[PDB]
Amino acid sequence: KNIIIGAMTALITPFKNGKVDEQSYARLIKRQIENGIDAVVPVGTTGESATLTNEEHRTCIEIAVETCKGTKVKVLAGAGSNATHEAVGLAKFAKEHGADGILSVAPYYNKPTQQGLYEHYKAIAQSVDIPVLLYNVPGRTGCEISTDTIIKLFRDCENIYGVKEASGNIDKCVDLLAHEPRMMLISGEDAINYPILSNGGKGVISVTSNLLPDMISALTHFALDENYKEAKKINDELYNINKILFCESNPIPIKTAMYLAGLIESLEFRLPLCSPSKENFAKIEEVMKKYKIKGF
Amino acid sequence: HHHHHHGSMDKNIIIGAMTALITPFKNGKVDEQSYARLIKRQIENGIDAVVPVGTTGESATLTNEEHRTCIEIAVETCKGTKVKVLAGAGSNATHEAVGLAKFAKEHGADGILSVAPYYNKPTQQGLYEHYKAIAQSVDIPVLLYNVPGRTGCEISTDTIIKLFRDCENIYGVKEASGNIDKCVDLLAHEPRMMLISGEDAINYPILSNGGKGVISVTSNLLPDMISALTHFALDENYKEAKKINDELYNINKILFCESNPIPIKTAMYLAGLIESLEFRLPLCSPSKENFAKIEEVMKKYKIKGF
Amino acid sequence: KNIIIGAMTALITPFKNGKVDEQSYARLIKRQIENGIDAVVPVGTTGESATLTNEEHRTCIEIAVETCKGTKVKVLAGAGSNATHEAVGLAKFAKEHGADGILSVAPYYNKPTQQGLYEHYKAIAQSVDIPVLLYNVPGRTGCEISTDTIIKLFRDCENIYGVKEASGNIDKCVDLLAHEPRMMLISGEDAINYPILSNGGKGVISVTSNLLPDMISALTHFALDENYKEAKKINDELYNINKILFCESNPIPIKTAMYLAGLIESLEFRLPLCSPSKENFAKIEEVMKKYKIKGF
Amino acid sequence: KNIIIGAMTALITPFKNGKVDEQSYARLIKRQIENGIDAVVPVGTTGESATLTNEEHRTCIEIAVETCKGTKVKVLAGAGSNATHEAVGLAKFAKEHGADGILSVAPYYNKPTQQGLYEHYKAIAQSVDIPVLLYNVPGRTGCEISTDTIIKLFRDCENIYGVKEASGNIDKCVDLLAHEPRMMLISGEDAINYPILSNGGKGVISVTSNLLPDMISALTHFALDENYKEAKKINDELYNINKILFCESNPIPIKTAMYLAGLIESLEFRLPLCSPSKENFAKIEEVMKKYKIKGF
Ligand SMILES: N[C@@H](CCCC[NH3+])C(=O)O
Ligand SMILES: N[C@@H](CCCC[NH3+])C(=O)O
Ligand SMILES: N[C@@H](CCCC[NH3+])C(=O)O
Ligand SMILES: N[C@@H](CCCC[NH3+])C(=O)O
Ligand SMILES: [Mg+2]
Ligand SMILES: [Mg+2]
Ligand SMILES: [Mg+2]
Ligand SMILES: [Mg+2]
Ligand SMILES: [Mg+2]
Ligand SMILES: [Mg+2]
Ligand SMILES: [Mg+2]
Ligand SMILES: [Mg+2]
Ligand SMILES: [Mg+2]
Ligand SMILES: [Mg+2]
């Protein structure tokens, strides 16, 4: 099986005058590459998938692919949708425009059954010939991909090689790798990156790495080298910033932090996302003071 | 200039017994001629309003063109009758929801339903700005829609009341949260709003506390019973309304043994009201066990034909 | 069946120098009788069941029985326990000492199965010949008595006549009375007293009635006569105090309010229960100013 | 601080004819000592604390103390209660009768505030001079000891040295040891024993070790010696039995399994606990067949 693992960043999407700032997007991706990141994920939840147009979603995949040329860094394109026909179209676009793989979030809002989830992902995997990583985040979608469904998809479909888990459920992470140890479990919760890696997870798809790419990369690579002491030391040091980046719904805090660090020009969202409360803005600024934030 | 005193300024409303219409498919396309026939069946069985393309209508998997087409068919079919069209126009992107709202206005809908943004979990401030922009885009009634089990977010009682008091067109909320405490909270602090039940099994408890209508899944199958329940309740004949709500519990519950609208489409198919048990992925046929369970509950109810 | 319905009060237990103030207990119950209450419940959760000794628990049942002699008010003695042999002993004491019926909370902490709950209540009901009211409060016990178990118990044991529901689940209340309309459903959540009664419930067991017995009494009797408009008006007017009485864990706010109204001499709890925060103390006082509180 | 760490067993309490089988209890403890277990915990939830009399609870502490005398195995006596005066009395008994420390579950059913929890445990810790381990299990108690309260108690009272966590929340486990790495975090959920130990936890209090003391012992000692690969291997191999032992509420499955293994003479509980369902009886019987169960 082809795989995409290691330290990965769920990229924020910067706006200027309501438009995607395509030149700041490329600059932010190069900053990730230059700080030890193994792959980048354009247009996930962190990238404001919901409020981009279909053209804008596709444009950001192209920029990521272009920016990573000549490097070892891969593009795991965000291509999920709650409509199977939309998700297949995004999968085919990413394949035909040079992405190395795709991420595929579980359908949100319409709550498919486990059978429907299996048929949803089977259609996606049959549409392309590049790796497909499942993405489970029940707090946002309203549904859960069960362990049985995940494992069945891993064994029945060639391109499906693992799952990104954002469920705060370490028991399920043990369940997954105890019954299918060949799968690639990827952490989708920054605060518990180390516990997932220490149980055999093979990477992270990170919000914090937008701000601190070198620290997330070092944490992951320490763990992959079985230097558990050093990986845990970074995970413990990062807890305070990992928590404050979710005081409000992601990506509101991380964009606030990137703005306070001078890495994005303006603190701009697309509705229904908005600026954080003045209280939480001050809380984020205060937590940041304990970390050394790399520039460009 | 904006202000905070819209509560008692005359708000156009859409209340009574309302149906969240299923969307029939034929060879993967919207069966536009079965859609019109089903809406006419609703009109002839005492329903006061219809809601095209909600969650029950598989809004998520329809294209933008198909979503707009189904609103047009509903508007056309209810012309010359007392039945209103409350167009489903929600989106998790504010610019999409504004575009749908303006479409519904410009093509003759009587009002709009607007679900709270799903998946991206906006803050209460974000929800306020989301709804504020939608309501300022049109001049027809806007009913908020709270269903946290599907969206991942909740519109607070405080936010709902602020929107009611700050914007002219927001006139109430459809609640699908299984939280009768919140329903008491809403009408005790803002009794001028229209609380609409979005949970069939508890239609009567919501109406008995001052709710003014239902937006029902069960009425797809049994429109006469849901309409009679509501009109009994609106006339304060609570004994007869409760008697029907009790009779419908078994079917109200079994219609969610799997995720709506999988059971209701199965039942409409078992009743001969649609030609195919067709969904758009990721939705699918129910399990064989749940199929039998649905068939088996239906037998105790009288289902009106065409 | 023989039943105990209507407006009922979950009595607070006052302490004086670390012992139960038995003369304040009697004075408080007499205040309930004179303000339209139909029954009183000694030693529930509100009465600090957990921290009373077995002798004090039994003494408090005795005081309630004595005080309601010669009146229309009944005593529904609190007799629950998470050990069946303890719950049987309390039930038999209540019977032998003149209680009109018993309330029996579902076993807490040890989480029995539905089969175990059935055997638990069957042994209790067979031990006495007075009415037994089940009590479901999953947020405190960790278990739920299923609708099926409640209906089975109602139909299989002669003296079990209903359930007190404190689960915030109006769907379950419709389920209960649609499938077994002969049972007595009793509200155990003050804020939704009117919605439960309007669906056919026949009474409440109230925390707020400790402070405002006349208002809860009028609400219940209005509703039982199908004067729903007048009952809803009181339920709506009581929402603010109904909510603030749970700003902290019951019975901390209600005992605070009774002290703030001068109805008890000292604001004393038994650890692990404690006085509320300074802020919540002031918040309860401010909500109270909007209500008419009867004295002695 | 004095501490009690390592691989520990939450002992089942066998009954025979409705009484505690005191000779089987001692025999079971000797089996634990002989399989590398570092300490035993009499009368927890697994020991049916709720349904034992005050005298039976105290007797089982005495049997554990006597059976482990002259050996290296410690006794961490279960002494919790939802009434502070009861918990202090149990704590003093354990001290006066030779226990090495005490475990003290957070108060169940009456839901104290964080301030009440602090005063509850401060009173317990001041009553004795032996180590005190807190016990958080919100699914059974209805309350949670916050990270702040645990750390404050650890820093303010000499005897309080850690917490047994049974909340399925690895984020909280990272939170605890990142802000107070000197405390002893003890796993209270068998399925995730290895992830908690891999983050710096120093022991387990196990249900599964009743049946497989050698395997739980080996898992813990592998982890404490930083052989993470071998500890994970055992944790992964134990997942199936760890899960089936909670198909129904603990200790119903574990007693069933001990009965099926011939380690106790009768499968009898005290109401409200009861035998499992017939299908669940068969399910436990299977999972056991994949494991090698040591005898006496
Ligand atoms: N509002 C749409 C937009 C999708 C286009 C970007 N992926 C959704 O969240 O599904
Ligand atoms: N999957 C998209 C499609 C919307 C198309 C119009 N109903 C969504 O649910 O937002
Ligand atoms: N702590 C004991 C007290 C029993 C005394 C009677 N309520 C319990 O909660 O079960
Ligand atoms: N049922 C009481 C009795 C305890 C006696 C031994 N701790 C309780 O669970 O607290
Ligand atoms: Mg995706
Ligand atoms: Mg700046
Ligand atoms: Mg006409
Ligand atoms: Mg909508
Ligand atoms: Mg107000
Ligand atoms: Mg009781
Ligand atoms: Mg008791
Ligand atoms: Mg009258
Ligand atoms: Mg204990
Ligand atoms: Mg735990």
DSSP strand content of chain B? 5-15%
Q: Give the percentage of residues in beta strands of chain A.
A: 5-15%
**Overall 3D shape of chain B:** globular
CATH T-level topology of chain B: TIM Barrel
Main pleated sheet of chain B = 8 strands, parallel, barrel
- Total count of strands of chain A: 10
Instruction: Indicate how many domains the architecture of chain B comprises.
Output: 1
Question: What would you give as the CATH superfamily of chain B?
Answer: Aldolase class I
The CATH architecture of chain B would be Alpha-Beta Barrel
Task: Output the CATH class name of chain A.
Answer: Alpha Beta
Number of domains of chain A: 1
**Largest sheet entry of chain A:** 8 strands, parallel, barrel
Backbone structural class of chain A:
alpha/beta
CATH topology of chain A: TIM Barrel
Hetero groups: lysine, magnesium ion
Helical run tally of chain B: 13
Task: Report, as a whole number of angstroms, the end-to-end distance of chain A.
Answer: 36 Å
Order of helices and strands of chain B: EEEHEHEHEHEHHEHEHEHHHHH
Q: Span between N and C termini of chain B?
A: 51 Å
User: How many E-type strands of chain B?
Assistant: 10
Assembly state (oligomeric): heterotetramer
EC number (chains A, C, D): 4.3.3.7
Active site (chains A, C, D): 135 (proton donor/acceptor), 164 (schiff-base intermediate with substrate)
GO molecular function, one term (chains A, C, D): 4-hydroxy-tetrahydrodipicolinate synthase activity
Pfam families (chains A, C, D): DHDPS
